């Protein structure tokens, strides 16, 4: 019941943004580069470790251990969902898009069932190893913020962020393409006068998915569905 | 932390194989091993075997997800798409390039090194306890009067150890390169039990194919050593394959 990895067993490698490592195969290491952790740096570490060690799911990033500040997880080869959708030459077929949506819904459903709120769900936090949800959370990111988020964070907030991810999948683009100033999005979305353009969705997009999307993007936090129903709907049409 | 899944949360589906293994629905696809059973004496006997699976967080080890007490005792893991290394090698006949074979061997070395690092002895490593998820990722499971082909001589005749696992791995290496089971020439369990046990029978290395790294064949022999002590450990088993 100790996920403390004795330091010196890990061979850290190239920088990523976090290092690629070697422990009992390929691993991904997060090194907190400080002389001595502040009291704030300490609780941040415990909390991420505490919530990571309660996850055992195929669609959640595999936490492998910690070191005392370091967090060891599985190495994921490939790029994030952000790269593939926005900064990539190659697009995806619908069957794959719906598949990416389903796995993410499974992971999000798993977390919510464990009383865990990601509080930072976005296409950049979704690694396409097989969907892998990482970069945790408790138990630039403005585009994925619910109107009440601009305590605001809840299961409903994750539901909204999930809705934007759906929008990315079904359109390929980021929301609010006609805006280059962050302060107005904050104002317009925050007030309740701005919403993603669901007319941008592909012709291939099932009306079912387009409906579900609008539900997750509801202006009022309480009209948004729950992942048990979100997964049910996605699983059905698939 | 309790990893117990409350009664009713899992929807058991089709029987896969014989406890008994089923495919289920729990936050997605899962696998349920229904134990052939509860008695309060066996109740705590069940948790011991779970509190060991509880310390496996590795990509090459089958992902343990939770356990059940009601209705009956069950082990819950991830669901693996595709068949076993056994089926690929001796049934599907799927042609693997030498490139992939080494990687499968490499991943299995990673998984086994990790287990031994956790001081866990598998006691039964064979090509049908190794599942090729997505036909790419190796998943070692089923470690929590049958298959003797992977049994070391000291096991046939503290007989279970890290070196006995190493032997089973050598047989696996044999399967990967030879594309077939050892002692296929001889169809007699009692003969193999007798001859391997006394040390007069060993795998035929004339059947491994030409495209085989001579470090790997040399590595096979090290694991297939009839003498327990003459076998290399998994850190070194993995280091050499990795370098190779
Ligand atoms: C972590 C490993 N332990 C929890 S274990 O020793 O109980 N390992 C464990 C746990 C649950 C199921 C199985 C399993 N067992 C199978 C045999 C060959 C023994 C009948 S197939 C199979 C399986 C698991 C997942 N997907 C598919 N398609 N098949 C398993 F090995």
From Swiss-Prot, chain B:
User: What range does the record give for the signal peptide?
Assistant: none
Which tissues carry this protein? Brain and testis.
Result of changing residue 198 to K: Increased kinase activity and stability in response to EGF treatment
Location of the active site:
124
Where is the crosslink of kind Glycyl lysine isopeptide (Lys-Gly) (interchain with G-Cter in ubiquitin)?
A: 126
Q: Where's the Protein kinase domain?
A: 10-232
Q: What is the effect of changing residue 57 to H?
A: Loss of MAP2K1-mediated-BRAF-KSR1 dimerization
Q: Which amino acids does the record list as binding ATP?
A: 16-21, 33
Effect in UniProt of substituting residue 143 to L? In CFC1; also found in colon cancer
Disease note: Defects in BRAF are found in a wide range of cancers. Colorectal cancer: A complex disease characterized by malignant lesions arising from the inner wall of the large intestine (the colon) and the rectum. Genetic alterations are often associated with progression from premalignant lesion (adenoma) to invasive adenocarcinoma. Risk factors for cancer of the colon and rectum include colon polyps, long-standing ulcerative colitis, and genetic family history.
Subunit notes for this chain? Answer: Monomer. Homodimer. Heterodimerizes with RAF1, and the heterodimer possesses a highly increased kinase activity compared to the respective homodimers or monomers. Heterodimerization is mitogen-regulated and enhanced by 14-3-3 proteins. Heterodimerizes (via N-terminus) with KSR1 (via N-terminus) or KSR2 (via N-terminus) in a MAP2K1-dependent manner. Interacts with MAP2K1 and MAP2K2. Found in a complex with at least BRAF, HRAS, MAP2K1, MAPK3 and RGS14.
Q: Which family does the UniProt entry place this protein in?
A: Belongs to the protein kinase superfamily. TKL Ser/Thr protein kinase family. RAF subfamily.
Annotated protein name in UniProt: Serine/threonine-protein kinase B-raf
What organism is this sequence from? Homo sapiens (Human)
Q: Which gene encodes it?
A: BRAF
